[PDB]
Amino acid sequence: GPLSLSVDAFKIPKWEFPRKNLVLGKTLGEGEFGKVVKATAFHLKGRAGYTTVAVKMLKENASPSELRDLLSEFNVLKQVNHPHVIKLYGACSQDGPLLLIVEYAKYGSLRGFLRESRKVRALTMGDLISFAWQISQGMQYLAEMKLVHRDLAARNILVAEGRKMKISDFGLSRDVQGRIPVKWMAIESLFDHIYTTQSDVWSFGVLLWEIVTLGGNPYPGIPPERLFNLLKTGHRMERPDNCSEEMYRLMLQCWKQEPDKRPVFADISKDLEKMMVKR
Amino acid sequence: DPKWEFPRKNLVLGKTLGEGEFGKVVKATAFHLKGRAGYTTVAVKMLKENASPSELRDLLSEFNVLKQVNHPHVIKLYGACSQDGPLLLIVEYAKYGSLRGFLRESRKVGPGYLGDERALTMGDLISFAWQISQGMQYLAEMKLVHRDLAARNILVAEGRKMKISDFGLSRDVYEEDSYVKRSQGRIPVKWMAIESLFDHIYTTQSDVWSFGVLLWEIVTLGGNPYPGIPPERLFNLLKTGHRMERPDNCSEEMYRLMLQCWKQEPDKRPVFADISKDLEKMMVKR
Numbered sequence A: 001g002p003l004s005l006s007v008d009a010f011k012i013p014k015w016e017f018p019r020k021n022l023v024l025g026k027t028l029g030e031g032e033f034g035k036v037v038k039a040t041a042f043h044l045k046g047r048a049g050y051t052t053v054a055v056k057m058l059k060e061n062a063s064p065s066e067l068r069d070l071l072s073e074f075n076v077l078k079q080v081n082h083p084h085v086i087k088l089y090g091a092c093s094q095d096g097p098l099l100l101i102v103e104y105a106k107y108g109s110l111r112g113f114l115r116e117s118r119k120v121r122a123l124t125m126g127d128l129i130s131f132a133w134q135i136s137q138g139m140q141y142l143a144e145m146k147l148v149h150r151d152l153a154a155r156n157i158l159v160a161e162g163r164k165m166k167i168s169d170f171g172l173s174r175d176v177q178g179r180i181p182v183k184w185m186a187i188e189s190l191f192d193h194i195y196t197t198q199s200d201v202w203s204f205g206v207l208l209w210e211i212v213t214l215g216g217n218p219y220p221g222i223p224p225e226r227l228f229n230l231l232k233t234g235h236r237m238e239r240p241d242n243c244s245e246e247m248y249r250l251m252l253q254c255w256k257q258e259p260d261k262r263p264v265f266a267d268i269s270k271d272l273e274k275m276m277v278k279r
Numbered sequence B: 001d002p003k004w005e006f007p008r009k010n011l012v013l014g015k016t017l018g019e020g021e022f023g024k025v026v027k028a029t030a031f032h033l034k035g036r037a038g039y040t041t042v043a044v045k046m047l048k049e050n051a052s053p054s055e056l057r058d059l060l061s062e063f064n065v066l067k068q069v070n071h072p073h074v075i076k077l078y079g080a081c082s083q084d085g086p087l088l089l090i091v092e093y094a095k096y097g098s099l100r101g102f103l104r105e106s107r108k109v110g111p112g113y114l115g116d117e118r119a120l121t122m123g124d125l126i127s128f129a130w131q132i133s134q135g136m137q138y139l140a141e142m143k144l145v146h147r148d149l150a151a152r153n154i155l156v157a158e159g160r161k162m163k164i165s166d167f168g169l170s171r172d173v174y175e176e177d178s179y180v181k182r183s184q185g186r187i188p189v190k191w192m193a194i195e196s197l198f199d200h201i202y203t204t205q206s207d208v209w210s211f212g213v214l215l216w217e218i219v220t221l222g223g224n225p226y227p228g229i230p231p232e233r234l235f236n237l238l239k240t241g242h243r244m245e246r247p248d249n250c251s252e253e254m255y256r257l258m259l260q261c262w263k264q265e266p267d268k269r270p271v272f273a274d275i276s277k278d279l280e281k282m283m284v285k286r
């Protein structure tokens, strides 16, 4: 099928890394399907000595969809290059299991970074606006490349050195049933199965809510089965504590029913630029 | 449904029996359940807060299948709470847990594999296989492919009664006697049949392949199939004609049943009625 062709094509030069040069270390995170380990890579892309990386792999009970996701993530990350998108270095496909070598982000996920942090780790409202803007800049680039991310959330933003935001998890991203958690999906994605750049805008609004709440769980105490009816009727998440009126108006605009009425990623970046400079 | 809807006030949730990224099972108790007096100990299948549509569809699909099916070797649905709250499915509590966990316990726990309830013989392992094949024969007659047939999804109830469970991925096959999926499957690669992997075809004969893998797990005492081989390499191995080697606690007759289950051409595989007949003959000769 489609996957057996891809697996054969992937197993078989720019992106192929020698397996002898890679030394895997501790586990950075894990599920039943797959895991990420910290590693070191000798002579990676013409670098001197050892380069610290993260290595994405599958576990022994991996399904076809999980194997397709990893190859899909490889295929997208070849085509993209931006300071706020995760850098693919390459992949081991000739020696053992299929590994993807990506950049190491020292502070981990944005969800974990914010949950570790406290009220205004010292983070200010300017720092939270800065994190939002960096993700909006990365999403502006991806939208220009005709690439819907689909799973845009705080767990999938990585926090690199100098607190530089990195969009990651391109397994479910597509060019232009679903496996995105219901609380981050747009209304047209839920009802009509439509995924556009404007459905990423809705998901960015949820990511903005996570950033302002310091890694809070969206729609708290509401199961995802009930969310079909609530979003249909016009209910949204209320304004959280330590959130401005301008910031909440950006969230409510992201969560409009009609996708045309939502702001584009160029508009979001401009709003956050205006928020920063006025402070 | 009047038959299957249960009052939420009568259900009292307890400790977590198992969990994944998508969903969870908790031990619970149900007051006045299906005309019983007082509290009946049960298991409650539910979703986690980060659940997708496919995971929500799978739970409803499992619920819809368990309404229609009734067998001594299939997990009993008692009911569901589905109105004004999270979707809960009330199933029977199986005291010994999954068959994978039970058999892996019988390595460390005594008296263990010999050759009362923890003391396992080769006859008892043949008995577990037969009960699952009897249940799969019934599901095959109902035009129902299980798809995720594995030792983790067989539950071990009181009196060591085998119960097939995890019907999230199971699909109907009345018309054409096959389920075809355009996109990629969510069944682990090491339990999938060759035509399921390459061609996306799921029939009763693809469950037979998966039963052959379950037979390998049972005889190895909860072993991991294709040990030290990643699932990416399994495309090439199964295509060339490689299969799992004969494990140490396995007869020649029992291994011939596994090799027949793993034939390339699905028509050449045995049906679940034939598998039950082989296990009946193995039992009586021992």
Ligand SMILES: COc1ccc(CN2[C@@H]3C[C@H]2CN(c2ccc(-c4cc(OCC(C)(C)O)cn5ncc(C#N)c45)cn2)C3)cn1
Pocket: A028, A029, A030, A031, A033, A034, A035, A036, A054, A056, A057, A058, A066, A067, A069, A070, A102, A103, A104, A105, A106, A107, A108, A109, A158, A168, A171
């Ligand atoms: C399809 O293949 C897959 C799919 C999912 C997975 C792993 N999954 C579970 C949920 C998803 C994503 N997972 C991780 C694990 C580690 C990290 C991670 C964590 C991390 O942590 C730094 C620390 C330890 C907090 O200081 C640094 N870096 N650098 C790059 C990555 C990547 N990728 C990381 C991010 N996500 C955990 C693996 N392969």
Ligand SMILES: COc1ccc(CN2[C@@H]3C[C@H]2CN(c2ccc(-c4cc(OCC(C)(C)O)cn5ncc(C#N)c45)cn2)C3)cn1
Pocket: B017, B018, B019, B020, B022, B023, B024, B025, B043, B045, B046, B047, B055, B056, B058, B059, B091, B092, B093, B094, B095, B096, B097, B098, B155, B165, B166, B168
């Ligand atoms: C679609 O929604 C879903 C899908 C899957 C899941 C749960 N998944 C993860 C993998 C799959 C199956 N899971 C479990 C968890 C607990 C048990 C279980 C475990 C169990 O163990 C008793 C013990 C701990 C050995 O004493 C007893 N019972 N009784 C009924 C069930 C059920 N169901 C159990 C079986 N499968 C864990 C939840 N929602």
